[PDB]
C-alpha cells in the first residue's frame, strides 16, 4: 500500500509549528499501516516521528489520542528521548471518557519504567476500580506489564485489583483475579487468600474463570488462612456453569487429582461432569473429551464415542476431523487400542496425503505406547513401509532398527527384503539403507542373504550416495561377522557402484583395504553386531500424536554407607573411630524453605560419633559464612572438633560436622540429647541463590535438638538361635534390670518397643508373640559399634500391663549398660 | 492472563491485509505473513467455528472475501475464542459502518487498527463487548 | 478500612450556639467562641476553665489565641474584634474589623497579622503590634466569608471559603486572590489546609451534604466525601490520622478514611447541629462546635506497635523502609546510648492484613501481624505464611510460643502453635485479658488467673491489672496495676494439689496457689 520512508519523514513536520490534527492523525495512520501491512520502520526518521509526535499530545481529539497510542507504543522501542511522552498520556488519562481512559493507560504503562512508575500510581488506581470493562481492564493488563520494571509500585495496587474482582463482569473480574495472582504473591499463601474469596461464588464469567482454574488446578488447602478442603466452588471441581471449555479445563483435572471430590450436583470424581455436554454441535470438540478420569480413560471413554468416531469417519473435512480424531486419541488409552487403531486406519480415508503417514506411522506407534504385542508393532511398521514407501526416512532407519533389535531382527530383515521387492530407487535411500542395515547385521541365516544381497545391488546403482556408501561397510561388518559372507562382498565391491563412485569409493577403499588387506582385528572389532550408528528413544509415537489433528548411577544403598562417604572425605571422622553405622533415624532439626532447613544425622563409629548436620541458609536477606553447628551433649561426650560449612548463601546447601567421642564405660544411655545452635557470619544478600555485601554482622540462628537413640549405635540383625550367640557375646558383661511398660497392654507392642528404641531386630521374629501369653522370651540381637555385638534377652511377664527382665550381654560393658538404661 | 494468541484477518489468500499479534511470536513481516497463510490453508474452505493448528485451537469465520480469525488455546474451546471472534467480525462492521469485506478494512484502515487494539490486549482479552469498542474508538 | 482510633470526650461546656472552636497555638487550652455574645477557654487537660471574655451582647462568632502577645482576638457582631489579654485580663484593643459579623479570624504567628473573614464578603488584614491597623484588605469575594485558614507551606498565603461556590487562595501582598479554586458547588462553608511541609491540599464543605477534597497543587478534585446525609456545616483534616472529620446541621460528625472514603464512625451526643470542626496541628485533638454547646474530643493512637526479637528484626508498622499494609523493619544498630539511632531497616516479606498491632516473636522465629479480629504468622525472617488464627487482640505470653488471644466470645482464649487451646477457657467471663503463663482474665471486679493446665482458678487478685507478665519460669509474676506493681509467687506444688481438688472459687479462687511475694 505504502512507503515507510516517505511518512516516517513528512511526521518531522510536527516537531516544528504545525500541529494540524487532521495531517498529523493521518500521517499516524500511515505510520499504523506501514507496520500492519507489514513493512520495517526506518530507525533515523522514526526517532524523528517520534519527537515530532509528542507535540501533537497537546491538542486533545479524541481519534487523535488514539492514534498516539497505537502509534508511540509500535514506535517506541525505534525511537529515542521518548521520556516526554508521559507527561502528556497522563494529562490524556485523567480525562474522563472510555477513549481516553483505556487507550492511554496501556500506551502510558508501556513506555513507562521504574523511574516513571511512581507517576503513573494515582492514574492508575482511579482506573482500575473502574467497572467500565475498558478503563479497568487496560489497567489491569498495564499493571502486569509494570511488575517487571517496578513490583512493588504494583502491588500497592492490589486493593485495587480485588475490588475489581468482585465485579462478575467477565472482564473486570477476568483481568482482576489474573493480575492479581501474578501481583500479590510473595509466598503462595498470600495468592490463595486472594483465590478464597471469590471461590465461593457461582460467577457468569467464563474468562475468570478459566484463568482462575489454572491457579487452582493444584489442590489448595491455605486459601484464606486455611480450610478443610480443596474446595473450589467456582467451576474446577463444581459445574455451577456449564460451558464446555471450562467444564473440559475442569472436569480432567479433578477427576484423578480432586480440587474437591464429586458433589450430586457437582461431578469432581466421576466421570460426568464432560460427559454430560458430549452430544453438543462443533462445540462438542471440547466436551466430548476426557483425559485421566476415574480411575481411567476407558469408562469414560465409551461415552462420548458416539461423536468422536462418527465424525472421524464421516468428515473429510479437516477442521471437523481434526477435532474427531484429537477426541477419539482422548477418549483412548490401553483398552479403548483396538478400538483407537480400527478408527486411526480409518481415518486416512478421509485426509489422505501426510494423513495417511501418519495413520500408518500411528497404527504402530499405538500398538507400541499401548502394547497389542511388540510384534504387531512391527507388522505396522511393515504396513507403514508398504504404504509410503519413503514419507519412513532417516530417523526411521535408526527407530526401525532400534526398537526392532528388541525383539523381532531376523523378522524384519526378512520383511524388509520382501519389502525391498517394491521399487528399485524411488524406495528411497532409506529402505535399502535399512534392508542393507538388517541383513548386514543379523547376517541372514533365517532366509538366505542373496535375496537380499540381489535386492539391495540393483538398488545402489540408482541410488544416493549415503546408501551406496552403507552398502560398503555393511558389506564390510558382515564380512567380519560371516566368513560364509566374504565371496558376495567381493562382487559387489569390485563394482562401479558400491565402490569407486565418489563417497562410496573413499569409505570402500578403506572397508575393503581393512577386510581384503589387513588384520580384521580391526573388522571384528568394529562389528558388535553391526549395529546403527546412534540409539535414540522411540521417537515417533510423539510425533504421530500431535501430527495426525493438524546413566544414574550408585554406590550406597544403605544410609550408612552415603553418609559413610561424606564423612570419608574429611579425615577426622574416620581417623577416630571407622564407621560402624549411620542413624537409620535421622531428624531434621528445621524445617524445609523457612529460615534453614538443616537435616541432622548422627553417625556412631568405634569410639566415636560424628553429626553431620546438612545446613542451608533459606534467608532470603542473607547469605552466610564460616556457618557451624554447636553442640551441647547432655551426658559424657567430649566434643573434639567442629567441621563448617564453608558458605551458606540463600538456598544453597552446606554442610558442617560435629566430631564427639562416645563414652564407653556410662552406666546410663548412648541415648543422649544435644543441644544444637547454628552460629555464622551474615553478609547482606539481595535475594537471587547468593550475593555478600562488603560488610556484615554476626548473627546466631536456633535450631532443635539432636536426639542420638541406641538405635544409632546399633544395626539390627537376627540369630538362628538366639541362646547361643545371647551366651557367645559375653555373659562376662551381663547385667539385668527389671522394667515395668505400663503404656504397653501386650507382649507384640512391647518387643517393637525395645526393638526401635535399641536398634535391635528381635530373633526368630520374636515381634509376633502369641497374643496376650503369660510368659515369653524374647530374643534380640544386632551389632553395636565398634563392631561388636550386643544381644538382649527379655523374659516377659504379661499380667495386664507388661514386665520384663531384661538380661543383656555385650562384649563390652557399655551395650549392656545402654540398652538397660534406654529401654527404662 | 492469555487467552487469544493472535487475530488476523486475511484475505482469500491468506496474505495480510491484516494481522496484529498479541504473540510476540511474530513481529517480523515474514514470519507474521507466513503465520496468516498457515492457518488460512487449514482453516479454509471448511467452515466451522473449530479447526485445530499448531495444536492451538483456531477460531474462524468468513465473509465474501475475508477469513477473520482469533487463534487462541485449545485447552478452551471455540466458543470462548469465538467470543472474541464475534467481537471482532461485529466490532469492525459497525465501526467501519460497512460489514468487514476487504473493500470496508482497506475503506477505513485506522478504524481497523484501532478497534482490533481495543479487542485484544498482548493476548489477553481486552473487550468483547462489540458496541463498547465502537464508542470507544474514533474514526 | 480499618484505623487506630479510640474517640473520647476530653471535655464539654454548654451554651448558645458555638460558631468556632479552637485549639490554644501553643497551649493545652481550647477557646470556643459562643454566641453568648462570650467567648469561653477552657483547659480541658484538667478541667479548669482559664478565663472567660465578654466580646460582645451580641453572638461572638470567631475566637482565636495570639499566644506570643498572650493575648486572645474574638470577632463578634460588634462588627469588632476585640483583643483582649487573657491573663492580665483586660482588653488590650478594640478595632472594627469589618463591616458586619466576624465569622473567622486567623492568626499568623510568625508575622503580626490575624486576617478574619466576615460576611461582608471580605476579608481584612489587621496588625496586633501597630495596635490593630489595617494592614491590608482582601476583595475578591462577593459572598459571605464563612471560614478563614492560613496554608502551612507559606503563611503568607491563606485561603478563604464563602459561600459563593468557590475557595480562593489569596496571597497577602495582593488585595485580589491570585487564584480561584472553585470546590464546591453549594457555596464553600470551610477551607483548611492539610498540614505540613508537603501537603498541598484544600477541603471545601458544602450545603449539598458534601465535603470535597482538592489538591491545590494538581487542581483536581481528588474525592468526594459523603460527609453527612444532611448539609455539611465544615469539613477539615486530621493531620496526623489519615481521616476527614465532618460536622452537619443534623447533629451528627461523621469520620470517614482519607484513603477510601469509607465510614470510620458516626458520633452524636445530644448536643447536635455540629457547625464546626477544627483539629490540633500536634494532632489527636479535635474539637467540634455545636448549638447547644462545644465539645473538644480527642482521637485514638497514642503509641506505636512494635517488637523487638533477638534477631534484629525490629518490627513495626508505618514508618520509613516499612509500608503500613506489607510488614518491615530492622534494627542492628547500636551507636551510642544517648542519642536516637538509626531506623536499620532491613526489608521483609508479604503481608495479607493490616497491623492493629505488629510483633516479631522475642526470641526470633515467628512474626505476627494482627488485624481486624485475625492474626497472621508469618516467619521471623522469611516471611512466609506460618500460620493463622482469631485474635481481636494478640499478645505473646512468656512462652512466645503459646500466646494468650481475646476470640471474645467472653472466654480469654490462649493458642499455643497458632492453634486453639480449649484445654484453656476460664471459669470466671471475660472481660479482658493480661498474657503471660498464669492468663489473667477481668470479670466481675477481679482479676483471675488461670492455669494453662486444666483451668481452674487459682487465685483471684483483688485489684485488677494494667498487665500480667510472668517471668520465663512462670512461678514469679509482675502485675501492673493501678495499685501500682505487685510481684507474686505461684507456687507450683500447692497450685498442682489445689487445681486437681478445684477448691479454687469460680469467680474467687483459691487463696492459696498464689501468695503475694512483695
Known amino acids: 500500500h505504502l512507503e515507510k520512508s516517505a511518512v516516517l519523514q513528512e511526521a518531522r513536520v510536527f516537531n516544528e509549528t504545525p500541529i494540524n490534527p487532521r495531517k498529523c492523525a493521518h500521517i499516524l495512520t500511515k505510520i499504523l499501516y506501514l507496520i500492519n501491512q507489514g513493512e520495517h520502520l526506518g530507525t533515523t526518521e522514526a526517532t524523528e516521528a517520534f519527537f515530532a509526535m509528542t507535540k501533537l499530545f497537546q491538542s486533545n481529539d479524541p481519534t487523535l489520542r488514539r492514534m498516539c497510542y497505537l502509534t508511540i507504543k509500535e514506535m517506541s522501542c525505534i525511537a529515542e528521548d521518548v521520556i516526554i511522552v508521559t507527561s502528556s498520556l497522563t494529562k490524556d488519562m485523567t480525562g474522563k471518557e472510555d477513549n481516553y481512559r483505556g487507550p492511554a493507560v496501556r500506551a502510558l504503562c508501556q513506555i513507562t519504567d521504574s523511574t516513571m512508575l511512581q507517576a503513573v500510581e494515582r492514574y492508575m488506581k482511579q482506573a482500575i476500580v473502574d467497572k467500565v470493562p475498558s478503563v479497568s481492564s487496560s489497567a489491569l493488563v498495564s499493571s502486569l506489564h509494570l511488575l517487571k520494571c517496578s513490583f512493588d509500585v504494583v502491588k500497592r495496587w492490589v486493593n485495587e485489583a480485588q475490588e475489581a474482582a468482585s465485579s462478575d463482569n467477565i472482564m473486570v473480574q477476568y483481568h482482576a483475579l489474573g493480575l492479581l495472582y501474578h501481583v500479590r504473591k510473595n509466598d503462595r499463601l498470600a495468592v490463595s487468600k486472594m483465590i478464597s474469596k471469590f471461590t465461593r461464588h457461582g460467577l457468569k464469567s467464563p474468562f475468570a474463570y478459566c484463568m482462575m482454574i489454572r491457579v487452582a488446578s493444584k489442590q489448595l488447602e491455605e486459601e484464606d488462612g486455611s480450610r478443610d478442603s480443596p474446595l473450589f466452588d467456582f467451576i474446577e471441581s463444581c459445574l455451577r456453569n456449564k460451558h464446555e471449555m471450562v467444564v473440559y479445563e475442569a472436569a480432567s483435572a479433578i477427576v484423578n487429582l480432586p480440587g474437591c471430590s464429586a458433589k450430586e450436583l457437582a461431578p469432581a470424581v466421576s466421570v460426568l461432569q ?39 469417519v464421516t468428515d473429510s473435512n479437516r477442521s471437523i476431523a ?113 534392508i542393507l542395515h538388517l541383513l548386514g547385521q543379523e547376517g541372514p541365516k533365517t532366509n538366505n542373504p542373496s535375496k537380499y544381497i540381489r535386492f539391495i545391488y540393483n538398488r545402489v546403482v540408482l541410488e544416493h550416495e549415503e546408501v551406496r556408501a552403507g552398502a560398503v561397510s555393511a558389506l564390510a561388518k558382515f564380512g567380519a561377522q560371516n566368513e560364509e559372507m566374504l565371496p558376495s562382498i567381493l562382487v559387489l565391491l569390485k563394482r562401479c557402484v558400491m565402490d569407486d563412485d565418489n563417497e562410496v569409493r573413499d569409505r570402500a577403499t578403506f572397508y575393503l583395504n581393512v577386510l581384503e588387506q589387513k588384520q580384521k582385528a580391526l573388522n571384528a572389532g568394529y562389528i558388535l553386531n553391526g549395529l546403527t550408528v546412534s ?17 544414574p548411577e550408585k554406590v550406597a544403598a544403605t544410609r550408612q554407607e552415603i553418609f559413610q562417604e561424606q564423612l570419608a572425605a574429611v579425615p577426622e571422622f574416620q581417623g577416630l573411630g571407622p564407621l560402624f553405622k549411620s542413624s537409620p533415624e535421622p531428624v531434621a532439626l528445621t524445617e524445609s524453605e523457612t529460615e534453614y532447613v538443616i537435616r541432622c544425622t548422627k553417625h556412631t563409629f568405634s569410639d566415636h560419633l560424628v553429626f553431620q548436620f546438612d545446613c542451608t541458609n533459606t534467608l532470603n536477606d542473607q547469605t552466610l559464612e564460616n556457618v557451624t553447628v554447636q553442640m551441647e551433649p547432655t551426658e559424657a561426650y567430649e566434643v573434639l572438633s567442629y567441621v563448617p560449612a564453608r558458605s551458606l548463601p540463600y538456598n544453597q546447601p552446606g554442610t558442617c560436622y560435629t566430631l564427639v567421642a562416645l563414652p564407653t564405660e556410662d552406666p546410663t544411655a548412648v541415648a543422649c540429647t544435644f543441644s544444637c545452635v547454628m552460629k555464622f557470619t551474615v553478609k547482606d544478600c539481595d535475594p537471587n541463590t547468593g550475593e555478600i555485601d562488603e560488610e556484615g554482622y554476626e548473627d546466631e540462628y536456633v535450631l532443635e535438638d539432636l536426639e542420638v537413640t541406641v538405635a544409632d549405635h546399633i544395626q539390627k540383625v537376627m540369630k538362628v538361635n538366639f541362646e547361643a550367640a545371647w551366651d557367645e557375646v559375653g555373659d562376662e558383661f551381663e547385667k539385668e534390670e527389671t522394667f515395668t511398660l505400663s503404656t504397653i497392654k501386650t507382649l507384640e507392642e512391647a518387643v517393637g518397643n525395645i526393638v526401635k528404641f535399641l536398634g535391635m531386630h528381635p530373633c526368630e521374629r520374636s515381634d509376633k508373640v502369641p497374643e496376650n501369653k503369660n510368659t515369653h522370651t524374647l530374643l534380640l540381637a544386632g551389632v553395636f559399634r565398634g563392631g561388636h555385638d550386643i544381644l538382649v534377652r527379655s523374659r516377659l511377664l504379661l499380667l495386664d500391663t507388661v514386665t520384663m527382665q531384661v538380661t543383656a550381654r555385650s562384649s563390652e560393658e557399655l551395650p549392656v549398660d545402654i540398652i538397660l538404661a534406654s529401654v527404662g | 492472563l492469555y487467552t487469544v494468541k493472535a487475530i488476523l484477518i486475511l484475505d482469500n489468500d491468506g496474505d495480510r491485509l491484516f494481522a496484529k499479534y498479541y504473540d510476540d511470536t511474530y513481529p517480523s513481516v515474514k514470519e507474521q505473513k507466513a503465520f496468516e497463510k498457515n492457518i488460512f490453508n487449514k482453516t479454509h474452505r471448511t467452515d466451522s467455528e473449530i479447526a485445530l493448528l499448531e495444536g492451538l485451537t483456531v477460531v474462524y469465520k468468513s465473509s465474501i472475501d475475508l477469513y477473520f480469525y482469533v487463534i487462541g488455546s485449545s485447552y478452551e474451546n471455540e466458543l470462548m475464542l469465538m467470543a472474541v471472534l464475534n467481537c471482532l467480525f ?50 | 478500612m480499618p484505623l487506630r482510633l479510640d474517640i473520647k470526650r476530653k471535655l464539654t461546656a454548654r451554651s448558645d450556639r458555638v460558631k468556632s472552636v479552637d485549639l490554644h497555638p501553643t497551649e493545652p487550652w481550647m477557646l470556643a467562641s459562643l454566641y453568648n455574645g462570650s467567648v469561653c477557654v477552657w483547659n480541658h487537660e484538667t478541667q479548669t476553665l482559664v478565663k472567660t471574655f465578654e466580646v460582645c451582647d451580641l453572638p461572638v462568632r470567631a475566637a482565636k489565641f495570639v499566644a506570643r502577645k498572650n493575648w486572645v482576638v474574638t470577632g463578634a457582631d460588634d462588627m469588632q474584634i476585640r483583643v483582649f489579654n487573657y491573663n492580665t485580663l483586660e482588653r488590650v484593643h478594640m478595632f472594627e474589623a469589618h463591616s458586619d459579623y466576624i465569622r473567622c479570624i486567623a492568626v499568623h504567628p510568625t508575622q503580626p497579622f490575624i486576617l478574619t473573614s466576615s460576611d461582608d464578603m471580605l476579608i481584612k488584614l489587621w496588625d496586633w503590634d501597630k495596635k490593630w491597623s489595617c494592614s491590608q484588605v482582601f476583595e475578591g469575594h462577593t459572598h459571605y466569608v464563612m471560614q478563614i485558614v492560613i496554608n502551612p507551606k507559606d503563611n503568607n498565603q491563606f485561603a478563604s471559603a464563602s459561600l459563593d461556590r468557590t475557595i480562593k487562595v489569596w496571597q497577602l501582598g495582593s488585595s485580589s486572590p491570585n487564584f480561584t479554586l472553585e470546590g464546591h458547588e453549594k457555596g464553600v462553608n470551610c477551607i483548611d489546609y492539610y498540614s505540613g511541609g508537603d501537603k498541598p491540599y484544600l477541603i471545601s464543605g458544602a450545603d449539598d451534604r458534601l465535603v470535597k477534597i482538592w489538591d491545590y497543587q494538581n487542581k483536581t478534585c481528588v474525592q468526594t466525601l459523603e460527609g453527612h446525609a444532611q448539609n455539611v456545616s465544615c469539613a477539615s483534616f486530621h493531620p496526623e490520622l489519615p481521616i476527614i472529620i465532618t460536622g452537619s446541621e443534623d447533629g451528627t460528625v461523621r469520620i470517614w478514611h482519607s484513603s477510601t472514603y469509607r465510614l470510620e464512625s458516626t458520633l452524636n451526643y445530644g448536643m447536635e447541629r455540629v457547625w464546626c470542626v477544627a483539629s490540633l496541628r500536634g494532632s489527636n485533638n479535635v474539637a467540634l462546635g455545636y448549638d447547644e454547646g462545644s465539645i473538644i474530643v480527642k482521637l485514638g493512637r497514642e503509641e506505636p506497635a512494635m517488637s523487638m526479637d533477638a534477631n534484629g528484626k525490629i518490627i513495626w508498622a508505618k514508618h520509613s523502609e516499612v509500608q503500613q499494609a506489607n510488614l518491615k523493619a530492622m534494627g542492628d544498630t547500636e551507636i551510642k546510648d544517648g542519642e536516637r539511632l538509626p531506623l536499620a531497616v532491613k526489608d521483609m516479606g508479604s503481608c495479607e492484613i493490616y497491623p492493629q498491632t505488629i510483633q516479631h516473636n522475642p526470641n526470633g522465629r515467628f512474626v505476627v501481624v494482627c488485624g481486624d479480629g485475625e492474626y497472621i504468622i508469618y516467619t521471623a525472617m522469611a516471611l512466609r505464611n506460618k500460620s493463622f488464627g482469631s485474635a481481636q487482640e494478640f499478645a505473646w505470653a512468656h512462652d512466645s510460643s503459646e500466646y494468650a488471644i481475646r476470640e471474645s466470645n467472653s472466654i480469654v482464649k490462649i493458642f499455643k502453635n497458632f492453634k486453639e487451646k480449649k484445654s484453656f477457657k476460664p471459669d470466671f467471663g471475660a472481660e479482658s485479658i493480661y498474657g503471660g503463663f498464669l492468663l489473667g482474665v477481668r470479670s466481675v471486679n477481679g482479676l483471675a488467673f488461670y492455669d494453662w493446665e486444666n483451668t481452674e482458678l487459682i487465685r483471684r487478685i483483688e485489684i485488677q491489672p494494667k498487665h500480667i507478665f510472668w517471668s520465663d519460669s512462670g512461678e514469679l509474676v509482675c502485675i501492673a496495676t493501678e495499685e501500682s506493681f505487685f510481684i507474686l509467687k505461684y507456687l507450683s506444688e500447692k497450685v498442682l494439689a489445689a487445681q486437681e481438688t478445684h477448691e479454687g472459687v469460680t469467680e474467687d479462687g483459691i487463696e492459696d496457689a498464689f501468695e503475694v511475694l512483695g
Request: glycine share 4%; hydrophobic share 40%; net charge negative.
Open chain 1, 274 to 312: 464432560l460427559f454430560c455436554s458430549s452430544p453438543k454441535a462443533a462445540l462438542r470438540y471440547a466436551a466430548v473429551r476426557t483425559l485421566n478420569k476415574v480411575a481411567m480413560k476407558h469408562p469414560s471413554a465409551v461415552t462420548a464415542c458416539n461423536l468422536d468416531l462418527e465424525n472421524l
Open chain 1, 535 to 551: 540409539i535414540p528413544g522411540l521417537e515417533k509415537a510423539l510425533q504421530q500424536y500431535t501430527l495426525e489433528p493438524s546413566q
Open chain 2, 90 to 139: 461485529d466490532s469492525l462492521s459497525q465501526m467501519l459502518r460497512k460489514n468487514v469485506e476487504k473493500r470496508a478494512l482497506l475503506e477505513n484502515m485506522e478504524g481497523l487498527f484501532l478497534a482490533v487494539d481495543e479487542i485484544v490486549d498482548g493476548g489477553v482479552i481486552l473487550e468483547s463487548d462489540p458496541q463498547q469498542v465502537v464508542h470507544r474508538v474514533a474514526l
Open chain 1, 322 to 434: 481434526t477435532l474427531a480424531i484429537t477426541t477419539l486419541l482422548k477418549t483412548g488409552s490401553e483398552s479403548s487400542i483396538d478400538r483407537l487403531m480400527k478408527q486411526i486406519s480409518s481415518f486416512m480415508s478421509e485426509i489422505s496425503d501426510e494423513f495417511k503417514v501418519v495413520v500408518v506411522q500411528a497404527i504402530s506407534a499405538l500398538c507400541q505406547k499401548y502394547p497389542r504385542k511388540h510384534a504387531v508393532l512391527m507388522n505396522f511398521l511393515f504396513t507403514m513401509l508398504r504404504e509410503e514407501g519413503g514419507f519412513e526416512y532417516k530417523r526411521a532407519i535408526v527407530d526401525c532398527i532400534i526398537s526392532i533389535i528388541e525383539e523381532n531382527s531376523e523378522s524384519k530383515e526378512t520383511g524388509l527384503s520382501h519389502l525391498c521387492e517394491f521399487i528399485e530407487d524411488c524406495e528411497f535411500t532409506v529402505l535399502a539403507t535399512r
